[PDB]
């Protein structure tokens, strides 16, 4: 069909700056752990040492297959500059079939 | 209740520039295929002809109802500048009831 | 394990400007309703009084636990500048275990 459930996963994480986000995205592509990344600038807020702080970071969504999830989490844990980084996966319900094929081809290998 | 499961879907895709993202978003609204779109600038990375490339694009999330999903995918496939565009749907678990009503009203028609 | 299903929810909403998005994010943190927020600039389009309009807003994703969902929706409904704001939750499938612990600790209290 034009689209189907597929087996894509979307992993999200945030980084201290544009440079680090792009560098890690590139390293993940080199290892065929992701087929593509989309990064964007964000303003964040959270608790830190008893106070609410404002921060500027770069978020990134990583697109890959379910088969690469474990490896992706391990590589992100390896490369992340933060001690306790935000790393979580969102549920993908459907995906354009041709794109799913491209994702699969893009992550074939190591 | 204040919120419930609803029947909203979120479709994500990326475009070569701001102009194209907005133009397509407008065309989707004209056809009542989406109730709203949120677009933002992104930096992307993926494989292309054996090399890892960096790109600048505009991403967009399209908010509509489950009933419009098939039509939305067909219209996006029709208008997309890319040969193999990223088009996938994310799972929505809950939604403010009043907003869900607004979504339904916004996509009533053609 | 390195990651598991967890009990995190992601709530998304849009605001008229950067100032309002950050202010509300801060208020949600003060009440321990969210552990963190990530906000970014967006361009939006929707129907308004029979015409398709273009707008500039700031979107924000709120990260919290399933236990805080009801309270979060109530506080957002309380503080939102829009009469019919977009507020919905996305499904989180997996999450880095250490991060999940941080989320839980971050929302403990009121």
From Swiss-Prot, chains A, B, C:
Gene Ontology BP term (one): response to metal ion
Gene coding for it: cutA
Keyword Hydrolase: no
Function: Involved in resistance toward heavy metals.
Intracellular or extracellular location(s): Cytoplasm
Gene3D superfamilies, alphabetized: 3.30.70.120
InterPro entries: CutA_tolerance, Ion_tolerance_CutA, N-reg_PII-like_a/b, N-reg_PII/ATP_PRibTrfase_C
Protein family per UniProt: Belongs to the CutA family.
Record-level Gene Ontology MF annotations: copper ion binding
UniProt keyword terms in alphabetical order: Cytoplasm
Protein name per the record: Divalent-cation tolerance protein CutA
Originating organism: Thermotoga maritima (strain ATCC 43589 / DSM 3109 / JCM 10099 / NBRC 100826 / MSB8)
């Amino acid at each position: 069909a034009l689209y189907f459930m597929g087996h894509m996963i979307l992993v999200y994480s945030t980084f201290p700056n544009e440079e680090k986000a792009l560098e890690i995205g590139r390293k993940l592509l080199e290892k065929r752990l992701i087929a593509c990344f989309n990064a964007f600038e964000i303003r964040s807020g959270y608790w830190w040492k008893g106070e609410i702080v404002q921060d500027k970071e770069w978020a990134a969504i990583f697109k890959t297959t379910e088969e690469k999830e474990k490896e992706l989490y391990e590589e992100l844990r390896k490369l992340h500059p933060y001690e306790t980084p935000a790393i979580f996966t969102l549920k993908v319900e459907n995906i354009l079939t041709e794109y799913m094929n491209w994702l699969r081809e893009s992550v074939l290998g190591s």
